[PDB]
Amino acid sequence: FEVDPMDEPTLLYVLFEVFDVVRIHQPHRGVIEAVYLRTPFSAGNA
């Protein structure tokens, strides 16, 4: 990445995208269980 000179520190803001689902389930009335994922960085297959 190559940008021209400004005089105020700027911050590049790349957004490496990627799938980001969450699949709430709801079994017994009263519980919600969530199980996320993010696939180019990874998270709670919880």
Partner 1 sequence: PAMLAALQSQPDWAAAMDRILALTTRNPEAFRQQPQANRFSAILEAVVPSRTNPTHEKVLAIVNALTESKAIRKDEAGLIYNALLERVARYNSTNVQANLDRLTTDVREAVAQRERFMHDTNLGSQVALNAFLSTLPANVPRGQEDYVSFISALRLLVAEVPQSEVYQSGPDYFFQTSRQGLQTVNLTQAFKNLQGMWGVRSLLTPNTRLLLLLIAPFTNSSTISRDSYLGHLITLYREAIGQTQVDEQTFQEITSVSDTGSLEATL
For partner 1, which is the closer residue by CB, 23 or 29?
A: 29
**Is residue 27 within the footprint of partner 1 (CB under 8 A)?**
yes
* Long-range contacts, 35-38 (Cβ 8 Å, 24+): none
Contact 37, 43 (CB under 8 A): yes
**Is residue 28 within the footprint of partner 1 (CB under 8 A)?**
yes
Contact 28, 20 (CB under 8 A): no
**Is residue 29 within the footprint of partner 1 (CB under 8 A)?**
yes
For partner 1, which is the closer residue by CB, 9 or 29?
A: 29
* Residues at the interface with partner 1 (CB under 8 A): 27-29
